[PDB]
Subunit: 240 residues, 4 copies
């Protein structure tokens, strides 16, 4: 129970990676706050977690909308929930060839996938600093490092997340706060699947639990000397 008395926030925790990350953290004793864009999903998350024997709280949050972010934190404040572990999982793609890409597609992805890390980390870091302990872990993507056509905006955001994290890691280190990125390759969440996995050494697409286990490792007290790092979980498709 490494994480007894820690409170963890996992954005977009409804399904896939987010949920598994929420499951993995609760499994180590953490209290988990998960977010979804709708109330119904926030309830589905909450009941499903509490159903598996966990103390969880489902809350509404759209990380792309500063008003939502602002309301969100007023609520955890009202519910006396201090965040010790932040997992930036939520995000979106707006794929297009750069030449046809509109301002909305570019700006939406930068705003949702990059600025959101700044905005969420900004609202959690003072708490962790006072308590002299914290974890910030962001879900990146292999494409932030390898690049990918049709995704100039997504790759830019994802690379920026790493840059942000390396920089913040310097700022918060003296307070026992680590800041890291977990970069997934192809993860289950159409075959196509066969061809995709031929570009992957292991010959298979990963699963949400692959990402959750890495996030949970980085969030544990035993990864305290790991900061500013990018941990690629991708079956060898990209090796740094």
């Amino acid at each position: 129970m490494s994480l007894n008395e820690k409170v963890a926030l996992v954005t977009g925790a409804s399904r896939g990676i987010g949920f598994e990350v929420a499951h993995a953290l609760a499994s180590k004793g953490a209290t988990v706050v998960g977010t979804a864009t709708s109330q119904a999903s926030a309830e589905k998350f909450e009941n499903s977690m509490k159903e598996k024997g966990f103390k969880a709280r489902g809350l509404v949050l759209n990380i792309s909308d500063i008003e939502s972010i602002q309301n969100f934190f007023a609520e955890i404040k009202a519910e006396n929930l201090a965040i010790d572990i932040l997992v930036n999982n939520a995000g979106i793609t707006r794929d297009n060839l750069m030449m046809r890409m509109s301002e909305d597609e570019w700006q939406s992805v930068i705003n949702t996938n990059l600025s959101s890390i700044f905005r969420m980390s900004k609202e959690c870091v003072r708490g962790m600093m006072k308590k002299r302990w914290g974890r910030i872990i962001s879900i990146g993507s292999v494409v932030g490092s390898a690049g990918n056509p049709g995704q100039t905006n997504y790759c830019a955001a994802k690379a920026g997340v790493i840059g942000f994290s390396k920089s913040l890691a310097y700022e918060v280190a003296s307070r026992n706060i680590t800041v890291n990125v977990v970069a997934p390759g192809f993860i289950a969440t159409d075959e196509q699947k066969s061809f995709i996995a031929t570009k992957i050494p292991s010959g298979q697409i990963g699963e949400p639990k692959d990402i959750a286990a890495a996030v949970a490792f980085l969030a544990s007290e035993e990864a305290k000397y790991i900061t500013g790092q990018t941990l690629h979980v991708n079956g060898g498709m990209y090796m740094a």
Copy 2:
């Protein structure tokens, strides 16, 4: 004289790295469009270069205003200047501890250092593709790879520039367009001049060579990547920093 038939666009070409870049490409025979915030500065650049016997145009361009970008590409269109080499020199810093950083300080940096590359690249790519030749080169920064406290905004933007360039390099490679980043370390410049004696000294402790770079160091790397002989280099980041950061 690899670049005799080429037209280069250098943003913020008035002085420093921007100006040496202009000089460097013109030297190779390029016709160079340099951009500046003001008409006088733009005029100053043009007269400067033409004085040294180069083919040069200085135009007004503010890279944070979508409107200004729009007017600019219309003017070169009418002047029959199609861009073959784009050098993104633009960028600013608004340093602050992350916890204190304002929405303005964050968004300003992202917009001016990162979103600008997309905006400018988008206006030049079609012409290059049409001709099946192009160079896109963006001036990044050592902190984009190393990180640096007090610059979560600038580090995110500069790292983002690399991600953008990697991605774009794939889209345009078939049309013989390369996309690369030159990442300066500590270079003598107007910005660096601001720094105090102490913070100059501190940075000195991080440079194995014991030298502070000069704009020509950046210009040279840029001009090399712009040349035909760099055709087989794309999606790369070339660090020019005296050993401060080794990739």
Copy 3:
């Protein structure tokens, strides 16, 4: 606790990082074979591990000596030990400015810190492949990636360990064998003033790490839940180098 019935080999397990790694794997129920260069150290290791209620075997191995390696694998074979987890921990430094550096200082370091990786993995990979499960994890070093003056030989070796691992990862990935590198920064295990200064200036917290920091990371990679991580270098260095 998934490591029950898994057999692990940690070279140079007598003390420091190797010993903590052996303790971490054992703690997950692995049977741990630890090696040392002397019989006294092998037994001391074994006795210590068994002392703590773990199953362990201490054997003699000089990873720099081919004959020693040949005898070693002859012995594990006669003891019916199939190696599921290989942790290449053992190594050495012969520091010098490049220009003064002897052929012998160069060769010894490449031989002990790089070639040993090839030689130990070559003796373990067939077993893993037949069972279709394996972990190879080598202890690298921050200097393999960052470089460090006075250590051209060591940096070359530790960078090569990464090259080897990436290549090997491709060859064995389909048989559910992962190959990774854990690269420690400064870890307390006799510090030079330079090292103390580097600690003070290059690590954001200014704190040196501990053997448990490296053991936890090795154990995480060795676990079934890291099945989808291969060809990677996990830096455990307090942020002194950020890849």
Copy 4:
């Protein structure tokens, strides 16, 4: 002609990358010493260069053999040749699955591609430090950073080249010596000519443009790094691979 009065050494300069590198350096003004494993290839080199109007010398070197290295440096010293620029281009593959790989296959590759770097740099670095100027440039491979199946020895070696080079960069940086690696991707050479039509085609799927590079591509990057205007670049790996690997 920043290389007038400089002397460069290219190991394995008979053909392919080695020869174009020699050619590229001489074009910047360097006096070039090239090496071959045979007295006939050594002459052929010297003849070919001097034919093209260059000041060149070809000498025999079996770089796997320390005694040969010893005799070579004896020879250049007897001849008044002080090396300012060292390009380590010699190297071989012995591809096999790691599990089948012999000691010969392993050590031959480590010795030729990695140990040779130390041995040759050790013989040039003093004179460079004395003169307070030098370049060391090693030819790596993309697989050194990307990894490749069937080449555990070669990938190990070429990754070691980068580690060695970073380390050496710190030691010599203050004496104005830079140390860098140029890492070719898929370039037309003799061993490439030994690939089946199908192997070639398959590799093309890994390069964005789908183009195979040429020796001039590597020679151009090497000559850049060797030039004086590359003075602030050290400890770097410049990937020349058409986008096959982006770092």
